[PDB]
Amino acid sequence: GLFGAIAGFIEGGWTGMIDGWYGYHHENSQGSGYAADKESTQKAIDGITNKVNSIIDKMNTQFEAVGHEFSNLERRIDNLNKRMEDGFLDVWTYNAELLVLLENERTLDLHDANVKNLHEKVRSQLRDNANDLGNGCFEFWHKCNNECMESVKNGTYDYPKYQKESRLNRQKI
Amino acid sequence: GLFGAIAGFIEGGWTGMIDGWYGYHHENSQGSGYAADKESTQKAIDGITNKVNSIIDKMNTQFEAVGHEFSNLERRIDNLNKRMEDGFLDVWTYNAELLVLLENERTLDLHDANVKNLHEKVRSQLRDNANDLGNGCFEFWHKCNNECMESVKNGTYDYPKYQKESRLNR
Amino acid sequence: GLFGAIAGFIEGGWTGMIDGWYGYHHENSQGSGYAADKESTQKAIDGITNKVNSIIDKMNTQFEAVGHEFSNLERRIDNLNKRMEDGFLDVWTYNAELLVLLENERTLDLHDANVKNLHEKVRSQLRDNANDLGNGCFEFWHKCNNECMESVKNGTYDYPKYQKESRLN
Amino acid sequence: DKICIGYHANNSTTKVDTILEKNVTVTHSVELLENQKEERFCKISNKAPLDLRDCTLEGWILGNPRCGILLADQSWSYIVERPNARNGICYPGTLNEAEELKALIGSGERVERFEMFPKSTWTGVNTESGVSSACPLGNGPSFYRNLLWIIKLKSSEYPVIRGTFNNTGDKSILYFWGVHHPPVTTEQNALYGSGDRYVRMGTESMNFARSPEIAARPAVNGQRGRIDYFWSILKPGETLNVESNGNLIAPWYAYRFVNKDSKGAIFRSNLPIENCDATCQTTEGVIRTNKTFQNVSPLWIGECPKYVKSKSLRLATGLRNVP
Amino acid sequence: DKICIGYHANNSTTKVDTILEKNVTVTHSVELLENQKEERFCKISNKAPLDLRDCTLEGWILGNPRCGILLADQSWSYIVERPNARNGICYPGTLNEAEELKALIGSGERVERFEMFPKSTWTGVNTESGVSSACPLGNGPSFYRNLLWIIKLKSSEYPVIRGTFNNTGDKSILYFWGVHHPPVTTEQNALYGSGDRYVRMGTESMNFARSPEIAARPAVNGQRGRIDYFWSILKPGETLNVESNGNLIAPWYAYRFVNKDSKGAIFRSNLPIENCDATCQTTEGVIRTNKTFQNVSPLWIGECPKYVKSKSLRLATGLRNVP
Amino acid sequence: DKICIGYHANNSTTKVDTILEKNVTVTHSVELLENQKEERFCKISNKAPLDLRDCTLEGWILGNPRCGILLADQSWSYIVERPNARNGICYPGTLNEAEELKALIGSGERVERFEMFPKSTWTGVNTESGVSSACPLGNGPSFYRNLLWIIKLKSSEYPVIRGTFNNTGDKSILYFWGVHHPPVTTEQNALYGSGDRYVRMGTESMNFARSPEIAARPAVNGQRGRIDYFWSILKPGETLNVESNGNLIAPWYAYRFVNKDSKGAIFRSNLPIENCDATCQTTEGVIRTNKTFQNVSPLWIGECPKYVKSKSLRLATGLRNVP
Ligand SMILES: CC(=O)N[C@H]1[C@H](O[C@@H]2[C@@H](O)[C@H](O)O[C@H](CO)[C@@H]2O)O[C@H](CO)[C@@H](O[C@@H]2O[C@H](CO[C@]3(C(=O)O)C[C@H](O)[C@@H](NC(C)=O)[C@H]([C@H](O)[C@H](O)CO)O3)[C@H](O)[C@H](O)[C@H]2O)[C@@H]1O
Ligand SMILES: *[C@@H]1O[C@H](CO)[C@@H](O[C@@H]2O[C@H](CO)[C@@H](O)[C@H](O)[C@H]2NC(C)=O)[C@H](O)[C@H]1NC(C)=O
Ligand SMILES: *[C@@H]1O[C@H](CO)[C@@H](O)[C@H](O)[C@H]1NC(C)=O
Ligand SMILES: *[C@@H]1O[C@H](CO)[C@@H](O)[C@H](O)[C@H]1NC(C)=O
Ligand SMILES: *[C@@H]1O[C@H](CO)[C@@H](O)[C@H](O)[C@H]1NC(C)=O
Structure with a gap:
C-alpha cells in the first residue's frame, strides 16, 4: 500500500534535485541547496534494474506460429492450429499486460517506502534537537552549519553534541 | 506486509460508521458521533474499482474449444485436441485462482495502510497537544469544539493556536 | 516494500534466539535473556505455511505430453504437437520461475513488517517511561524486573504505575 | 475531549481466501464466477x-x-x-x-x-x-x-x-x-x-x-x-x-x-x-450474467464468460470485518 | 534496565532469488523442484x-x-x-x-x-x-x-x-x-x-x-x-x-x-x-519425491510432479539471515 | 535553520498504468514493446x-x-x-x-x-x-x-x-x-x-x-x-x-x-x-529494436521480440512525478 510519503505528507517533488531520486534540502547561515542521498538512490537503481532485467529474462522465450497450409479437407486440423496460436497469444498477452499493471504498482510503492524509510532514518537521529513539522521538514533548535548538515546526510549526527544548546532554546521559547 | 493498523493497535471496527470505510469518532461537551473520512474513502474506492475493472478487462478474452469430431483412425489428433483444450483450461484456472489469492491479500493490506496513514495524518498534526492512547484515539490537552474537530478532519489543525493552552496543563 | 526494520534500524539478527522468528532481549538486575514472541511468530508461521501450501495446491495439475509417432507425410501435425508441448512448457516455466521471484520478495517484506509492528507495539506502551535508542532497544526510566519485562512482552505493561518513578529521572 | 481514528465494520459473513489465510470475513466482496444456467436453447x-x-x-x-x-x-x-x-x-x-x-x-x-x-x-x-x-x-x-x-x-x-x-x-x-x-x-x-x-x-x-x-x-x-x-x-x-x-x-x-x-x-x-433470446448459449444451457467465469461448459456459441474449473472466485473489495 | 526487539538468525548459507536482489541468504526455505532419478523401470x-x-x-x-x-x-x-x-x-x-x-x-x-x-x-x-x-x-x-x-x-x-x-x-x-x-x-x-x-x-x-x-x-x-x-x-x-x-x-x-x-x-x-515398485515412472527413470516440480522428463506414466526447465525453485519461508 | 527530505521530479510527461490508477506520470520508465517496422524483406x-x-x-x-x-x-x-x-x-x-x-x-x-x-x-x-x-x-x-x-x-x-x-x-x-x-x-x-x-x-x-x-x-x-x-x-x-x-x-x-x-x-x-540486412524478418516487415515484445506480426524468421496484442507495455522505473 501507500507508505504516505510521496504525494502524501510530503506534498510535492523537487525539480531542483537532479542527481538522484531521494534526497535533502537544507537551510543554514551559508545558504540553501539540494543533495541526493547516493546510498538509497543507488540501492533503488540496483533493485529496479534487477527487476526489469528479471522480467525481460522470463519473457525470453517465444511461442512461434508458422505458415503451414491446409486443404479444404483439413478444416479441423486448420482450426486446431489457429485456436492454438490464438491460445498462446492470449496467454502471453495476459501475462505481460497484467504483470506490468501489478509491478508498476509495486515499483511506485517501492519509491514511496524508500522515501518513507529515509525520513525515519533522519528523524530517528535528530530526536528532540529538531522540530518535526509533519511535512517532511525539520527545524533545528540550534545552529546547524554545513558540516552539521553533512553529518545528518551521512547519518553521523552527534545528538549529545547539540543537546544542551537545544534545551536552552526550548526553555526560552 | 501487514501495516498493523486494522486488527492491530486499532483493535476493532465500527458498526456505527456507515457512510465510509475510514473515519473518526469524537466527543465534545457539544456531543459525540461517527464521521467517515470521505477523502481517503473515495481514493480507496477509485483504486479498488479500477483494480477490479482492470482484472475483469484482462480476463476479457476466452479460449473457446469446439465440438469437432474424430474417427477411430484419428486417435492421435483427437488426443492432441484433448491435451490442448485441457492445457489452457488448467492454465486459466491457475491464473484465476492464484490471482484471487494474491490480490485479496493485497486488497486487504491496502485498507490496512490507508487506516495507518490516516492515523499518522492525525498524530503528526496534534503532536504534544494531545495524548496518544496508542489505540487510535487521542485525548486533547485542551478543549476542542466541533469546529476544532473539523480542522483535524480537514487536515488543517492549528498547532501553535493551542500550544500555549495545552502546555500549561502539566 | 521494505519496512526498514530487518537489516534496517535494527541492524542485525540474534543467533541467540532459537525458539522463534521474532522476539525480545531484556536486561535487569535479575539478569538478561532472549525470548521469542510466540504469538506473532506463530501467526507468521501459519501464514507462510499457508502460502506454500496454496502454491503447491495450484501447481497440482500438469500438462502431460505423450509419445505418439508421426510419419514424414504428417510433418505438419508433428510440428503442431511439438509447438504445443513446448508451448505449455514455456508457460509453466514462466509461471513457476516468476512466481518464486515475486513472492520471495513478498515473504521477506512480510517478516520485515512483523518486526516493525512488534517494535511499534512496544513503543506505543512504554512511551516516555523509556528512552528510544533508535536501534530497537528501550532504556527504562525506572526499574523493570522480570514481572515488569513480561507485562511488556505479554502486552500488559502498566504505564501509569511507573509514571512517577520515571519522570523524576 | 477525544478523537479516534477507526474503520468500518458490518453484519457481513461473506468470506474470501487469501494467500496467508483462508476463510477470512470481509465487509465487501464480489463473486466473479457464474455457475447458473437455463437448461434450454x-x-x-x-x-x-x-x-x-x-x-x-x-x-x-x-x-x-x-x-x-x-x-x-x-x-x-x-x-x-x-x-x-x-x-x-x-x-x-x-x-x-x-x-x-x-x-x-x-x-x-x-x-x-x-x-x-x-x-x-x-x-x-x-x-x-x-x-x-x-x-x-x-x-x-x-x-x-x-x-x-x-x-x-x-x-x-x-x-x-x-x-x-x-x-x-x-x-x-x-x-x-x-x-x-x-x-x-x-x-x-x-x-x-x-x-x-x-x-x-x-x-x-x-x-x-x-x-x-x-x-x-x-x-x-x-x-x-x-x-x-x-x-x-x-x-x-x-x-x-x-x-x-x-x-x-x-x-x-x-x-x-x-x-x-x-x-x-x-x-x-x-x-x-x-423462442427466447440469449447472448450466451452453452451446450449445457443458457447463461445470463455480468460475471467473468463459469462452471458449466467449455462449449458455447455467442459471447460467454471464460470457462474455468473453479467453484468460486470472489475478490475482496472491502476490508476485514471485525465487529 | 532495557528491553530490545529483534529477529532470528542462524548459520544458514542457503540462498534464494528475489525480484530486487539475487543470491540472498535466508534462515529458512524450501526447494520445490526435484532433479534426482533412479535410472531404471x-x-x-x-x-x-x-x-x-x-x-x-x-x-x-x-x-x-x-x-x-x-x-x-x-x-x-x-x-x-x-x-x-x-x-x-x-x-x-x-x-x-x-x-x-x-x-x-x-x-x-x-x-x-x-x-x-x-x-x-x-x-x-x-x-x-x-x-x-x-x-x-x-x-x-x-x-x-x-x-x-x-x-x-x-x-x-x-x-x-x-x-x-x-x-x-x-x-x-x-x-x-x-x-x-x-x-x-x-x-x-x-x-x-x-x-x-x-x-x-x-x-x-x-x-x-x-x-x-x-x-x-x-x-x-x-x-x-x-x-x-x-x-x-x-x-x-x-x-x-x-x-x-x-x-x-x-x-x-x-x-x-x-x-x-x-x-x-x-x-x-x-x-x-x-524388481521394484514406483508411483512415478518417467522414460528417463523413477522419481521418488514430495516436491512439486521435476527436471527429468516430459514423458511419464504414473502421477508425477510438473515438468519445468528450471534448475532450482526455492521459496523463502524464513527471513533474511543477518548474523 | 532547517532540513527537509524530498524526492525527485522533472519535466517528464511519459505515463504508465497501474492496477489502482491509469495515466500516471512517472519520472522514468521503459517501453518493452516495439510497434515499428520496415515494410520490406x-x-x-x-x-x-x-x-x-x-x-x-x-x-x-x-x-x-x-x-x-x-x-x-x-x-x-x-x-x-x-x-x-x-x-x-x-x-x-x-x-x-x-x-x-x-x-x-x-x-x-x-x-x-x-x-x-x-x-x-x-x-x-x-x-x-x-x-x-x-x-x-x-x-x-x-x-x-x-x-x-x-x-x-x-x-x-x-x-x-x-x-x-x-x-x-x-x-x-x-x-x-x-x-x-x-x-x-x-x-x-x-x-x-x-x-x-x-x-x-x-x-x-x-x-x-x-x-x-x-x-x-x-x-x-x-x-x-x-x-x-x-x-x-x-x-x-x-x-x-x-x-x-x-x-x-x-x-x-x-x-x-x-x-x-x-x-x-x-x-x-x-x-x-x-538490399538490406535484418536480424529478424517478419512477413509484414523488418524489426530493429532491443525491446522484448513486438506488435507487428506472429510470423517471422530470425530472432524477434515476443508477439502480443498490446499497444503498449511500459514499466515504470522512476517514481510518481509531482512538480
Ligand atoms: C423387388 C425387385 O426389384 N427385385 C426382387 C426380385 O424380384 C424379381 C422379379 O420382380 C422379376 O420378375 O424376376 C426376377 C427374377 O428374374 C426377380 O425375382 O426378387 C428377389 C428375391 O430374392 C429380390 O431379392 C431380395 O432383395 C432383398 C434386398 O432388397 C430390396 C430391398 O432393399 O428391399 C428390393 C429393392 O427394390 C432393391 N433395390 C433396388 C433394386 O434398387 C434392393 C436392392 O436390390 C438391394 O438392396 C441392393 O443391394 O433390394 C433381400 O436381400 C432378399 O434377401 C433378396 O432375396 C429382389 O429385390
Ligand atoms: C480546509 O483545508 C483547505 C485546504 O485543503 C483550506 O483551503 C485553503 O485555505 C488557505 C488559507 O486558509 C488558502 O490560502 C487556500 O487557497 C485554500 N485552498 C486550498 C486549495 O489550499 C480551507 O480553508 C480549510 N478549511 C477551514 C475551515 O480551515
Ligand atoms: C458455363 O460454363 C462455361 C464454361 O464451361 C463458362 O462460360 C461459365 O462457367 C458458364 N457460362 C455462362 C454464360 O455463365
Ligand atoms: C550469484 O551467484 C552466481 C553463481 O555463480 C554468480 O554467477 C553471480 O555472479 C552472482 N551474482 C548475481 C547473480 O548478481
Ligand atoms: C488517459 O485516459 C483516457 C482513457 O483511459 C484518455 O484520455 C487517454 O487514452 C489516456 N491517455 C493516454 C496517453 O492514452
Missing part, C-alpha cells in the same frame, strides 16, 4: 437454431425420407443434434470424410435446396424403382431424397450415362453421390451389368473415379450390400461432369451454401429449443 | 512393464517368428521399446496406419491370443509352404505367427476362398491381414493365377478391397516382393467375412483387446527393468 | 531470400516453362511466395500431398538441381513431342522442365521402358512423377496403346503401381484430360526402379535436398525485397 442475435429432431446430421443433409420436415431451406445460428436420433444413414455403408463434413456444415449459416440433376438427365436407364426396405417411408421401401439410385433398364443394357451442371450461380454448391457395392457378382450383373464398371466424377479442381468392390459381407438392416457415400463442394464458376456405366448413386438434389461470418457450433444435446 | 500398481526386447512394436503384434518369447497373453502397465531391436517387419512392405496402431496399443492393458482362422478354413489351396528366408524361425525359413501365407495349387486353380468369424465374444478383436505383391508377372501367375485377383474384407462397419500392385523393386532382406500389411478392430457383435481369389495374407492368430481406463505409455529407452 | 545471416516472382511454389519445383528464371540450384534464408502468381500447375490435375510438400521445402535450406533420368534411359519411345498447349511458353506449346511426357512411337508401339537410380549420394533426393489420364479411349490408343497399361515405381520403402482412369473432365486450359502428380523422397542408400508400359510422366530433373538446422519460413506477400 435460445436464439443467438435473434436468429433461431436448427433442430435436427429425430434425424442425425447425416440423415438430414443426405435426405433420409423420414426427415421430410427438414428437407427445405434452412437458416440457423447453430445446430443441435439429438443423441438418440433414429433417422440417419439408413442404407449401410460409410460416408467418406464424415467428420470434415460436420465441421463444414457447422461453419454454415444458410443453405438452399434445389434440383441439381433431374431424373431425365440419365438417358437409357431406370431412374425409378431405386428404393430399399432399409430406407422406409411409411409402409413401403424408399431411398434418400437427395440421392438417386439408378439401375439398368430391364429390356436393354446400361449405357454410359452422363450429366453436367454449370455452377453459374452466386454461391457454393454442396452435393452428394455414392457407389453401390453388391455382395455377389449375380447382383452386380442383375442391377448394373458384367465386365468393368466405373463411377467417374470430375470438376475443374476435382478428380474422382471408382469401381465396384464385389464381396460377401454381413447383413446390416437386412442388407448385405453397401454404399460408399461421398460429398464435395462445387465452387462458384466450376462445372461437374458425371460419367458412369454402372453402380452409380447419382446426385439429385443439392444445396447452395452460405458461409458463417464468425464461428458456428453443433451441439449434441436433449435440451429443448424455445 | 519399475512396477506401476504392481503390474510389470512389457519389455519388447530385441523386437520392435510391429514385430511383436504381427508375430515375427523371432519374437516367440512375446507371442502369448500380455498384461502390462506400460511398454518399453528398445532403440535398436532387430526384429520388426521381417518381410518387406509397409504397415498401413502404423502410428494409429501404436497409439491403440499404448492405451491398452491386456491382450489375449487365440486362433482366429484355422488353416483348415481355406479349402482348395496350399495353406502350408507359405514361408520366407526374410522371416526365419531358428534354422529354416518361416513367416509371421499371426498371418497366413496362401499360395496356389499346382494341381488345381486358385479359387475364391472364404472365411467367417463372428465375434460373439466379450471383447474386441485386433487382427491383421495382408496383400502380397510379386515383383514380376511370372511370379504372380505361378503363385496365384493369370487373371485379375482380389483380396476383399468386410464387416458391419468396414468394406475393404485390393488387387495386386506389381512393380519391379530393389531387394530388401533378399526379397523383391512386398506385402501391404493391414489391421483393424472387430467390435463385439460384429462379424468378419473374408473373401479372396489371390494374393491373400490371411489372419491366423489374433488378439482379444481390453482398453485401458487411464493413460498408457510407450517408452524408448535402454534402461533396465527391475 | 532483407537478408538473414548474409543470405538473400528466394523470390518466386510470378511463379507459385508448385510451379517452381515442377519447372513450369514460364519459370525459366528460377531454373537452377536455389539457396535461400527464407522463401517468399507471391499472392497473384500465374505460373503454377499449368496442365490440369492434382498434386498429391501438396501441403506436406510445402512444409518440407519450407524446412529446407538449399536444393541442387540435377538430371535423374536422362532421355536415353527410356529406350524405344518418343521422348520428344510430349508437349501441350496447356503449358505454353510464349506462343507454342511447352511443358514442365523436371518432367518428361513420354508417348508412343509413331511407327510402332510403346514397349516396356525401365529406369533405375541408386542414391549412393550424399543427400536425400526430391523427385516428381505422374500418371497421365487421357479424356477418351482414342488418345489412350494413339498415345500409349489399347491393352492394359501400368506405371510402376519402387524403392526399399515405397511400392507404387497405377492404371489410367480415362474420363471426360471439364475443360481446363483446353484439356479434358488429367495427370496425377506425385512427389517423394529417395533416401540415401535407397534405389528407385521405374517401370512402365503406358501413361508415365517420368522424372527427369530432380533435387538434392538439404535440411535446415533450424526452422525456415515461407511468406505470402507483396512487399518489395531490398
Whole structure:
C-alpha cells in the first residue's frame, strides 16, 4: 500500500534535485541547496534494474506460429492450429499486460517506502534537537552549519553534541 | 506486509460508521458521533474499482474449444485436441485462482495502510497537544469544539493556536 | 516494500534466539535473556505455511505430453504437437520461475513488517517511561524486573504505575 | 475531549481466501464466477437454431425420407443434434470424410435446396424403382431424397450415362453421390451389368473415379450390400461432369451454401429449443450474467464468460470485518 | 534496565532469488523442484512393464517368428521399446496406419491370443509352404505367427476362398491381414493365377478391397516382393467375412483387446527393468519425491510432479539471515 | 535553520498504468514493446531470400516453362511466395500431398538441381513431342522442365521402358512423377496403346503401381484430360526402379535436398525485397529494436521480440512525478 510519503505528507517533488531520486534540502547561515542521498538512490537503481532485467529474462522465450497450409479437407486440423496460436497469444498477452499493471504498482510503492524509510532514518537521529513539522521538514533548535548538515546526510549526527544548546532554546521559547 | 493498523493497535471496527470505510469518532461537551473520512474513502474506492475493472478487462478474452469430431483412425489428433483444450483450461484456472489469492491479500493490506496513514495524518498534526492512547484515539490537552474537530478532519489543525493552552496543563 | 526494520534500524539478527522468528532481549538486575514472541511468530508461521501450501495446491495439475509417432507425410501435425508441448512448457516455466521471484520478495517484506509492528507495539506502551535508542532497544526510566519485562512482552505493561518513578529521572 | 481514528465494520459473513489465510470475513466482496444456467436453447442475435429432431446430421443433409420436415431451406445460428436420433444413414455403408463434413456444415449459416440433376438427365436407364426396405417411408421401401439410385433398364443394357451442371450461380454448391457395392457378382450383373464398371466424377479442381468392390459381407438392416457415400463442394464458376456405366448413386438434389461470418457450433444435446433470446448459449444451457467465469461448459456459441474449473472466485473489495 | 526487539538468525548459507536482489541468504526455505532419478523401470500398481526386447512394436503384434518369447497373453502397465531391436517387419512392405496402431496399443492393458482362422478354413489351396528366408524361425525359413501365407495349387486353380468369424465374444478383436505383391508377372501367375485377383474384407462397419500392385523393386532382406500389411478392430457383435481369389495374407492368430481406463505409455529407452515398485515412472527413470516440480522428463506414466526447465525453485519461508 | 527530505521530479510527461490508477506520470520508465517496422524483406545471416516472382511454389519445383528464371540450384534464408502468381500447375490435375510438400521445402535450406533420368534411359519411345498447349511458353506449346511426357512411337508401339537410380549420394533426393489420364479411349490408343497399361515405381520403402482412369473432365486450359502428380523422397542408400508400359510422366530433373538446422519460413506477400540486412524478418516487415515484445506480426524468421496484442507495455522505473 501507500507508505504516505510521496504525494502524501510530503506534498510535492523537487525539480531542483537532479542527481538522484531521494534526497535533502537544507537551510543554514551559508545558504540553501539540494543533495541526493547516493546510498538509497543507488540501492533503488540496483533493485529496479534487477527487476526489469528479471522480467525481460522470463519473457525470453517465444511461442512461434508458422505458415503451414491446409486443404479444404483439413478444416479441423486448420482450426486446431489457429485456436492454438490464438491460445498462446492470449496467454502471453495476459501475462505481460497484467504483470506490468501489478509491478508498476509495486515499483511506485517501492519509491514511496524508500522515501518513507529515509525520513525515519533522519528523524530517528535528530530526536528532540529538531522540530518535526509533519511535512517532511525539520527545524533545528540550534545552529546547524554545513558540516552539521553533512553529518545528518551521512547519518553521523552527534545528538549529545547539540543537546544542551537545544534545551536552552526550548526553555526560552 | 501487514501495516498493523486494522486488527492491530486499532483493535476493532465500527458498526456505527456507515457512510465510509475510514473515519473518526469524537466527543465534545457539544456531543459525540461517527464521521467517515470521505477523502481517503473515495481514493480507496477509485483504486479498488479500477483494480477490479482492470482484472475483469484482462480476463476479457476466452479460449473457446469446439465440438469437432474424430474417427477411430484419428486417435492421435483427437488426443492432441484433448491435451490442448485441457492445457489452457488448467492454465486459466491457475491464473484465476492464484490471482484471487494474491490480490485479496493485497486488497486487504491496502485498507490496512490507508487506516495507518490516516492515523499518522492525525498524530503528526496534534503532536504534544494531545495524548496518544496508542489505540487510535487521542485525548486533547485542551478543549476542542466541533469546529476544532473539523480542522483535524480537514487536515488543517492549528498547532501553535493551542500550544500555549495545552502546555500549561502539566 | 521494505519496512526498514530487518537489516534496517535494527541492524542485525540474534543467533541467540532459537525458539522463534521474532522476539525480545531484556536486561535487569535479575539478569538478561532472549525470548521469542510466540504469538506473532506463530501467526507468521501459519501464514507462510499457508502460502506454500496454496502454491503447491495450484501447481497440482500438469500438462502431460505423450509419445505418439508421426510419419514424414504428417510433418505438419508433428510440428503442431511439438509447438504445443513446448508451448505449455514455456508457460509453466514462466509461471513457476516468476512466481518464486515475486513472492520471495513478498515473504521477506512480510517478516520485515512483523518486526516493525512488534517494535511499534512496544513503543506505543512504554512511551516516555523509556528512552528510544533508535536501534530497537528501550532504556527504562525506572526499574523493570522480570514481572515488569513480561507485562511488556505479554502486552500488559502498566504505564501509569511507573509514571512517577520515571519522570523524576 | 477525544478523537479516534477507526474503520468500518458490518453484519457481513461473506468470506474470501487469501494467500496467508483462508476463510477470512470481509465487509465487501464480489463473486466473479457464474455457475447458473437455463437448461434450454435460445436464439443467438435473434436468429433461431436448427433442430435436427429425430434425424442425425447425416440423415438430414443426405435426405433420409423420414426427415421430410427438414428437407427445405434452412437458416440457423447453430445446430443441435439429438443423441438418440433414429433417422440417419439408413442404407449401410460409410460416408467418406464424415467428420470434415460436420465441421463444414457447422461453419454454415444458410443453405438452399434445389434440383441439381433431374431424373431425365440419365438417358437409357431406370431412374425409378431405386428404393430399399432399409430406407422406409411409411409402409413401403424408399431411398434418400437427395440421392438417386439408378439401375439398368430391364429390356436393354446400361449405357454410359452422363450429366453436367454449370455452377453459374452466386454461391457454393454442396452435393452428394455414392457407389453401390453388391455382395455377389449375380447382383452386380442383375442391377448394373458384367465386365468393368466405373463411377467417374470430375470438376475443374476435382478428380474422382471408382469401381465396384464385389464381396460377401454381413447383413446390416437386412442388407448385405453397401454404399460408399461421398460429398464435395462445387465452387462458384466450376462445372461437374458425371460419367458412369454402372453402380452409380447419382446426385439429385443439392444445396447452395452460405458461409458463417464468425464461428458456428453443433451441439449434441436433449435440451429443448424455445423462442427466447440469449447472448450466451452453452451446450449445457443458457447463461445470463455480468460475471467473468463459469462452471458449466467449455462449449458455447455467442459471447460467454471464460470457462474455468473453479467453484468460486470472489475478490475482496472491502476490508476485514471485525465487529 | 532495557528491553530490545529483534529477529532470528542462524548459520544458514542457503540462498534464494528475489525480484530486487539475487543470491540472498535466508534462515529458512524450501526447494520445490526435484532433479534426482533412479535410472531404471519399475512396477506401476504392481503390474510389470512389457519389455519388447530385441523386437520392435510391429514385430511383436504381427508375430515375427523371432519374437516367440512375446507371442502369448500380455498384461502390462506400460511398454518399453528398445532403440535398436532387430526384429520388426521381417518381410518387406509397409504397415498401413502404423502410428494409429501404436497409439491403440499404448492405451491398452491386456491382450489375449487365440486362433482366429484355422488353416483348415481355406479349402482348395496350399495353406502350408507359405514361408520366407526374410522371416526365419531358428534354422529354416518361416513367416509371421499371426498371418497366413496362401499360395496356389499346382494341381488345381486358385479359387475364391472364404472365411467367417463372428465375434460373439466379450471383447474386441485386433487382427491383421495382408496383400502380397510379386515383383514380376511370372511370379504372380505361378503363385496365384493369370487373371485379375482380389483380396476383399468386410464387416458391419468396414468394406475393404485390393488387387495386386506389381512393380519391379530393389531387394530388401533378399526379397523383391512386398506385402501391404493391414489391421483393424472387430467390435463385439460384429462379424468378419473374408473373401479372396489371390494374393491373400490371411489372419491366423489374433488378439482379444481390453482398453485401458487411464493413460498408457510407450517408452524408448535402454534402461533396465527391475524388481521394484514406483508411483512415478518417467522414460528417463523413477522419481521418488514430495516436491512439486521435476527436471527429468516430459514423458511419464504414473502421477508425477510438473515438468519445468528450471534448475532450482526455492521459496523463502524464513527471513533474511543477518548474523 | 532547517532540513527537509524530498524526492525527485522533472519535466517528464511519459505515463504508465497501474492496477489502482491509469495515466500516471512517472519520472522514468521503459517501453518493452516495439510497434515499428520496415515494410520490406532483407537478408538473414548474409543470405538473400528466394523470390518466386510470378511463379507459385508448385510451379517452381515442377519447372513450369514460364519459370525459366528460377531454373537452377536455389539457396535461400527464407522463401517468399507471391499472392497473384500465374505460373503454377499449368496442365490440369492434382498434386498429391501438396501441403506436406510445402512444409518440407519450407524446412529446407538449399536444393541442387540435377538430371535423374536422362532421355536415353527410356529406350524405344518418343521422348520428344510430349508437349501441350496447356503449358505454353510464349506462343507454342511447352511443358514442365523436371518432367518428361513420354508417348508412343509413331511407327510402332510403346514397349516396356525401365529406369533405375541408386542414391549412393550424399543427400536425400526430391523427385516428381505422374500418371497421365487421357479424356477418351482414342488418345489412350494413339498415345500409349489399347491393352492394359501400368506405371510402376519402387524403392526399399515405397511400392507404387497405377492404371489410367480415362474420363471426360471439364475443360481446363483446353484439356479434358488429367495427370496425377506425385512427389517423394529417395533416401540415401535407397534405389528407385521405374517401370512402365503406358501413361508415365517420368522424372527427369530432380533435387538434392538439404535440411535446415533450424526452422525456415515461407511468406505470402507483396512487399518489395531490398538490399538490406535484418536480424529478424517478419512477413509484414523488418524489426530493429532491443525491446522484448513486438506488435507487428506472429510470423517471422530470425530472432524477434515476443508477439502480443498490446499497444503498449511500459514499466515504470522512476517514481510518481509531482512538480
Ligand atoms: C423387388 C425387385 O426389384 N427385385 C426382387 C426380385 O424380384 C424379381 C422379379 O420382380 C422379376 O420378375 O424376376 C426376377 C427374377 O428374374 C426377380 O425375382 O426378387 C428377389 C428375391 O430374392 C429380390 O431379392 C431380395 O432383395 C432383398 C434386398 O432388397 C430390396 C430391398 O432393399 O428391399 C428390393 C429393392 O427394390 C432393391 N433395390 C433396388 C433394386 O434398387 C434392393 C436392392 O436390390 C438391394 O438392396 C441392393 O443391394 O433390394 C433381400 O436381400 C432378399 O434377401 C433378396 O432375396 C429382389 O429385390
Ligand atoms: C480546509 O483545508 C483547505 C485546504 O485543503 C483550506 O483551503 C485553503 O485555505 C488557505 C488559507 O486558509 C488558502 O490560502 C487556500 O487557497 C485554500 N485552498 C486550498 C486549495 O489550499 C480551507 O480553508 C480549510 N478549511 C477551514 C475551515 O480551515
Ligand atoms: C458455363 O460454363 C462455361 C464454361 O464451361 C463458362 O462460360 C461459365 O462457367 C458458364 N457460362 C455462362 C454464360 O455463365
Ligand atoms: C550469484 O551467484 C552466481 C553463481 O555463480 C554468480 O554467477 C553471480 O555472479 C552472482 N551474482 C548475481 C547473480 O548478481
Ligand atoms: C488517459 O485516459 C483516457 C482513457 O483511459 C484518455 O484520455 C487517454 O487514452 C489516456 N491517455 C493516454 C496517453 O492514452
